[PDB]
């Protein structure tokens, strides 16, 4: 019933996804590890944002008669100290856009408006993630990695 | 995360439109708020607020875009002298802003930023909504005649 | 119906008003992309005070049968980094604190005692500002800019 | 502390022009009371009832200074016979009332009584306040006509 | 319906015994209050509050009459010096004002007008209470002594 | 900086505010060791007053960049019965308000508006302590001394 | 019941202590205060309305021992002009305040006054409590340096 191309699209969007889940919950976990606990708080709500995108994702490719992939992971982009992880999860998002604006242009060239604005509502939370990792990598410049490290040790 | 050049341009625009209107509508509601008709006040300084917080939308994204939001320049307010010609005002004022809000949400389709489109399509579903407060306005005018509408306006 | 030169000087604080909105409200967003969300909600509420400032004015101004100027907005000082934004705060209020004073003098020569009391009011609220800033830029000098900046990243 | 003989008599002048204001507004909220124009009436009573406030400051500044407060003359009404007289009538004397009390405020500045000026100036802003009113009813009766604006004011 | 020309002349008699008594009630009042002798004073507010309201109901009987409410003519004031003379004073003006109301009451009953009978009547009532007041107070300093009155009236 | 001869207005009022402080509150507690309560309450609430305008003139010096001065202490007028003690008050709240007079005098000459909004608010509450004070003085010779303190022995 | 004179001598050098640290340690909070040290200042002003307890019960008892409390005679304050040093000029001046109030303690026992030596101690507890604070703070700064010791009590 649904396009193959745009259900093509959609589950490639699900791939970038499935990597971000394992990823941001990994650095959370390392930061809740190390002591910083508001870094890891804050990336695990990161992983939970994801976590409800690809489930809107799976219910729109079985709605639309497709088959989503979950047995497809990609690479985890793990980080070894707070800079790079930061860095890391920003490399991640700057790529799942690209592949949102994408399959956005391929919904309305056949006309899948509804999955068109699904994705749309993705591109905005994955445009605020990234607003939220270029801001952490320019405090750790302003303030210097020490004092940032220090301004999430406590929740 | 860089946006285009023209998106940018387009949005501080969009920005430099809603500047004008935040201080054609405020000194609008303070006139009618002086002579006493202070429903046609209150519902005008809710519409300037409603600029104020389109304003604070556009300069955060400009900001997040990496572009410079641009308050210096002020255009040209449209004052009125009486209450029709200050309703006329606002209206030509708001078909302008539409105008140049279509023109922007088209160039946002064109380099796929896709989240500054649908920025500027709540900001112009709100101008619609303004638009067709103030020509129900208009049309009150000619229905009952200008006494009774503002005798209608008096009281909040 | 009211002192022509007082009208005058009513529209000069305004014109000042204006332009503290303006200058404060875009610092104000400039911290908050930064992530310094202390100094950006802090900067938020002066621009949130000038602007009834401005109202308070613009209703003064009509009272006396005056034309409220909204139209000219003289020269915003945007600044670069945190010491220069503080720094184009203090100066704006300066000079808007001179042009009250000389406001003040002339509605006590002509005995407008109302327009004297407004104006007195919002003086005491800009020397309330000026208070913060020079101790925020004399709060850098004693900890230290990216201390300071630590200081100001959570609200 | 005996207060500066010439700040009193200016105290008990402005306590002449609330006593007048007092009996002025009364009869005028009772007028529009009495033909049904009950908002009017309503927001007359309560501006009779804020000069009755202003008198008992006075009454009790001019005691403290150990000056004599003057109850005893009564300084001429200005009672309409319609609505566009009475506000006018009002307006007339609010102006009047001003004047003596820029007047007061001056003399008070000059031998350093800074507290009565202060009591003097708050008296002011209530009576330019009230002055704003009055010249916005009128503007309105120009804007609505008579009737409509009576219209207008007949419910609470 | 317009009332007895005799009538409304007695009423605006009432009317006018009222307001001497609101004005030096309310003086003596704040002359109390600034020797610090504030029970005194705030029994004597009540009663000048009381006077207003008088003075209210017979400005809207008037009106309804259709005869014109008198507040320009203002009677002589009785102040006292001290706390003797003042409830000595008020006294001599309720005995003149009960006098008046008793003379209003039989020419309301010869021509008939029984509503402006029962309000001078209520009004009565009210003056008969005050003048138990004053004349209990003069007793009491009769049988305390001045000075251990004064004791018993200053806190409130 | 502030203007220095306002400044040493300030420091001036202050002076007196820590001489009635000390003043005040030292009778305060002479009437609640003679069991006159009602007086000594009064008295207390009197000594407060002037601790909060001490505190208001202290902090507006500060912000001046003035010295606040609280090592000169004055003359205490303390009395030894009654009627000297609030003969002792009010002598010193008439010199107090002569020197707010002159300081008034002073800012109204320099334009500081907002030092003398403070030094009036200062004078109004300086006001409403004499009328408390001459009030109790007439009293004492309306009722007589011993029905005075009869009255105010209970709080 | 007459006090030891030389027990009242000793009160009254404790309350003079008292008396010059509620001077300091107010200009000392509202230095912090105007600094933006709001921790810091919040602090000091609750360790300076500690000393007017104090200096109320030291009165209270010389009062009820039948001396005359010295409130005239006031020694020398110790203002710093650092953080640094006003917590230093606040722990000499401790220093020297528990110095005598140990001597007032020991002279209370020589002649039996049981009840003024238990005040004393009650006040000896609270300095000591005061200095623990300040030896405490002066160990922060060298442990954390200035910079950050500064940095910790800017918000309260
Ligand atoms: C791969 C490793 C994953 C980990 C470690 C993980 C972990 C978690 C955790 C700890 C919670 C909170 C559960 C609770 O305490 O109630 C959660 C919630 C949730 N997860 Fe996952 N998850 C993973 C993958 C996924 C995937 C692949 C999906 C869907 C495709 C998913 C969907 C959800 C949803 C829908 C919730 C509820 C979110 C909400 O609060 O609305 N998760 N997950
Ligand atoms: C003539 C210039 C302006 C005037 C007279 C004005 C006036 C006002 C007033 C009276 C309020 C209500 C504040 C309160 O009572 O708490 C307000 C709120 C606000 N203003 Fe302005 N304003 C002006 C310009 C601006 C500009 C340029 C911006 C932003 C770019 C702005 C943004 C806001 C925002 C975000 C609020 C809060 C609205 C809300 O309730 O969400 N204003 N303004
Ligand atoms: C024709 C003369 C006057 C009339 C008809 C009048 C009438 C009234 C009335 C109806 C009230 C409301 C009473 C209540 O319901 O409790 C009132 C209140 C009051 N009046 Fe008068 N009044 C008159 C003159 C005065 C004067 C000469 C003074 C003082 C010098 C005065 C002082 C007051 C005060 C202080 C109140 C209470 C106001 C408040 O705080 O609500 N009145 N008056
Ligand atoms: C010398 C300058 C002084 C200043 C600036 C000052 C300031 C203050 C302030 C601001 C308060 C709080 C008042 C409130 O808002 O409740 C206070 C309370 C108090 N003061 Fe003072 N004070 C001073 C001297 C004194 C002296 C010399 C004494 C006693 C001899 C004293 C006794 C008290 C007492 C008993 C309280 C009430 C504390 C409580 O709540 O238990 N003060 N002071
Ligand atoms: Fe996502
Ligand atoms: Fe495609
Ligand atoms: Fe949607
Ligand atoms: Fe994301
Ligand atoms: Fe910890
Ligand atoms: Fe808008
Ligand atoms: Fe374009
Ligand atoms: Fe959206
Ligand atoms: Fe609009
Ligand atoms: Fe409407
Ligand atoms: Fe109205
Ligand atoms: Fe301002
Ligand atoms: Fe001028
Ligand atoms: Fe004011
Ligand atoms: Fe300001
Ligand atoms: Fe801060
Ligand atoms: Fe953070
Ligand atoms: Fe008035
Ligand atoms: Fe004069
Ligand atoms: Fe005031
Ligand atoms: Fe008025
Ligand atoms: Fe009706
Ligand atoms: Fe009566
Ligand atoms: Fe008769
Ligand atoms: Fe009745
Ligand atoms: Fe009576
Ligand atoms: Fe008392
Ligand atoms: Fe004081
Ligand atoms: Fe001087
Ligand atoms: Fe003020
Ligand atoms: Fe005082
Ligand atoms: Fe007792
Ligand atoms: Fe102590
Ligand atoms: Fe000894
Ligand atoms: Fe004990
Ligand atoms: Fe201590």
Chains 1, 3, 6 share one sequence.
């Not at 690809?54 to 793990?78: M, S, T, V, Y």
């Not at 949102?100 to 509804?114: F, G, M, P, T």
């Not at 994955?126 to 302003?142: S, V």
């Amino acid at each position: 019933k649904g396009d193959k191309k745009v259900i093509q699209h959609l589950n490639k969007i699900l791939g970038n996804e499935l990597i971000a889940i394992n990823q941001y919950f990994l650095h959370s976990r390392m930061w809740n590890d190390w002591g910083l606990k508001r870094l890891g708080a804050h990336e695990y709500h990161e992983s939970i944002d994801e976590m409800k995108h690809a489930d809107k994702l799976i219910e729109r490719i079985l709605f639309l008669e497709g088959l989503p992939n979950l047995q497809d992971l990609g690479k985890l982009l793990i980080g070894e100290n707070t800079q790079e992880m930061l860095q890391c999860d920003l490399n991640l998002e700057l790529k799942a856009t690209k592949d949102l604006r994408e399959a956005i242009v391929h919904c309305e060239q056949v006309h899948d408006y509804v999955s068109r604005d699904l994705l749309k509502d993705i591109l905005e939370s994955e445009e605020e993630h990234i607003d939220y990792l270029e801001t952490q990598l320019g405090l750790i410049q302003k303030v210097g990695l020490e004092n940032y490290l220090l301004s999430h040790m406590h929740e």
